[PDB]
């Protein structure tokens, strides 16, 4: 299971000002950037060309080059068609990719208007998603008249997207299968509740994403353990914290247990009150302003 996504964001401030920015993610590694400031899709990995030839890449890059300038000018004209209806500023988002599976896939192209998902390319044409505004019917009828675009979109969604990704997965096999070891430390904070403490188990610098983290008393996993969101790191690693709320006093005898692939069995076990936890804590002292109140 691997999802390849081209995310595009276009801003239209008024009748003349506009910018379109796009990024490209495979799984959760950014492979391509293309800023409005540049007229060239940039590789962000030494393997972002996949298994494509130079001449194969130029044709695809030019395809999109024509697209960017055409897209902008199309939206502008549609706004003019719905002159009194919709008006600036207008925000458009395109999410277009394909998900890989024994040589089988499913492609998609989703379009959003003002942060809301309204249109997708389904089969041979554009389609208004149930729960779309009724004013969109005309502009869709206008776009569907283009036999030429429909042809190119279909070729990309049906054939090109899957053919390209298969190339990226073998070209980027090395990077997508890499193993980075997480490091952990401990801390605490006042709970929202009177006379309670929230303990924090910081896990940072690990790859890949999936990871198990739990506060425990020996064999018993504390059920109150809350998983935080996964937070990014510049070097494409991950930061995740697991918290535990406790009544000031239950703190000792607890432990933070971290399981990850890159450890291979040797789990990280931080004990609240160990000579190691103590040495770490005095290395991180501070005036405590402006702490989160």
């Amino acid at each position, epitope marked *: 299971n691997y999802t390849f996504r081209c995310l595009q964001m276009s801003s239209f401030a008024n009748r003349s000002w506009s910018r379109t920015d796009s990024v490209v993610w495979l799984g959760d590694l950014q492979t391509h950037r293309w800023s409005n400031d540049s007229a060239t899709i940039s590789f962000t990995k030494p393997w972002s060309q996949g298994k494509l030839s130079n001449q194969q890449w130029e044709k695809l890059q030019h395809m999109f080059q024509v697209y960017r300038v*055409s897209f902008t000018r199309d939206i502008q004209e549609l706004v003019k068609m719905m*002159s009194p209806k919709e008006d600036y500023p207008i925000e458009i988002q395109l999410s277009a990719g394909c998900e890989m599976y024994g040589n089988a896939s499913e492609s998609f192209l989703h379009v959003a208007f003002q942060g809301k998902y309204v249109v997708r390319f389904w089969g041979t044409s554009w389609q208004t998603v149930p729960g779309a505004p009724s004013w969109l019917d005309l502009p869709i009828k206008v*776009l569907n008249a283009d036999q030429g675009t429909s042809a190119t979109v279909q070729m990309l969604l049906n054939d090109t997207c899957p053919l390209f990704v298969r190339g990226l997965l073998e070209a980027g096999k090395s990077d997508l299968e890499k193993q980075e070891k997480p490091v952990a430390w401990l801390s605490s904070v006042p709970s929202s509740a009177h006379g309670h403490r929230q303990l924090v188990c910081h896990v940072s610098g690990f790859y890949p994403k999936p990871v198990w983290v739990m506060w425990m008393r020996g064999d018993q996993e504390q059920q109150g353990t809350h998983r935080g969101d996964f937070l990014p790191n510049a070097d494409e690693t991950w930061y995740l914290q697991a918290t535990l709320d406790v009544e000031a006093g239950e703190e000792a005898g607890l432990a933070c247990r971290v399981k990850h692939s890159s450890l291979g069995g040797q789990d990280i076990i931080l004990y609240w009150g160990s000579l190691h936890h103590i040495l770490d804590a005095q290395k991180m002292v501070w005036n405590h302003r402006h702490h989160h109140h």
Partner: T-cell receptor, first 113, second 106 residues
Framework: TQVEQSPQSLVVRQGENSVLQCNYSVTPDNHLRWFKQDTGKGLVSLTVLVDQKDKTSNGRYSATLDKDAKHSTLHITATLLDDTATYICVVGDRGSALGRLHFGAGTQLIVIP | VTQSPRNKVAVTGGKVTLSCNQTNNHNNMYWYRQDTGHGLRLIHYSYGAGSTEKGDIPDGYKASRPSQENFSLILELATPSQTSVYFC???????FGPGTRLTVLE
């Protein structure tokens, strides 16, 4: 200009073959169309060229398009007197209602009896 | 796709309207002008009843679309430079009107 035609004027003997050229730089290039304009009237569509390498044919008129060359050619086999008109090359950037046509300056065909 | 007037002699600073009427049920209409050495250039165009949009050279020109059928080019103050042959068009493939020869004098 984005649509260039050659020559300025073409003079052919009646009952011979006349050839007209068109060169464009319009990106993108959805289709191409040749119009006929009689002296003192409007433009009338002779033929369209849609494909990457297209070749159309209507009556004595026949046209060819090469989108990689960005170029087109109109042929009139066995030119008549009544073919004395201006011929206009037009390229249309989009294949929808949101398109914008680009007009060449035209070629004046004069047929000598 | 009818045009009226077919011919017009105007003075500098005089108000001139060029009408254009079509019964094809088309939403899009255009106003071009032809000048020797150039090839047709876009003045004003419309996406429907109540729409008017500037083209490549809208200066000295105003447009109006009262109904689906009609689309007029209004010249408030006329210039000698606005002496040209004006073509109207409709359609989504365009269809071109007979033309209007307009001379504006000092």
């Amino acid at each position: 200009t984005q649509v260039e035609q050659s020559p300025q004027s073409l003079v052919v003997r009646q009952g011979e073959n006349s050839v007209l050229q068109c060169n464009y730089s319009v990106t993108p290039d959805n289709h191409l169309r040749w119009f006929k304009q009689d002296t003192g009237k409007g433009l009338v569509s002779l033929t369209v060229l849609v494909d990457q390498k297209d070749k159309t044919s209507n009556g004595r008129y026949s046209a060819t398009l090469d989108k990689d060359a960005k170029h087109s050619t109109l042929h009139i086999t066995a030119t008549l007197l009544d073919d004395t008109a201006t011929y206009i090359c037009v390229v249309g950037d989009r294949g929808s209602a949101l398109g914008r046509l680009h007009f060449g300056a035209g070629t004046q065909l004069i047929v000598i009896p | 796709v009818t045009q009226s007037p077919r011919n017009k002699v105007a003075v500098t600073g005089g108000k001139v309207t060029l009408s254009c009427n079509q019964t094809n049920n088309h939403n899009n209409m255009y106003w071009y002008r032809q000048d020797t050495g150039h090839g047709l250039r876009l003045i004003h165009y419309s996406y429907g009843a109540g729409s008017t949009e500037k083209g490549d050279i809208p200066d000295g020109y105003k447009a109006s679309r009262p109904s689906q059928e009609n689309f007029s080019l209004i010249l408030e103050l006329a210039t000698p430079s606005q002496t040209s042959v004006y073509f109207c068009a409709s359609g989504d493939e365009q269809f071109f009107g007979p033309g209007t020869r307009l001379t504006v004098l000092e």
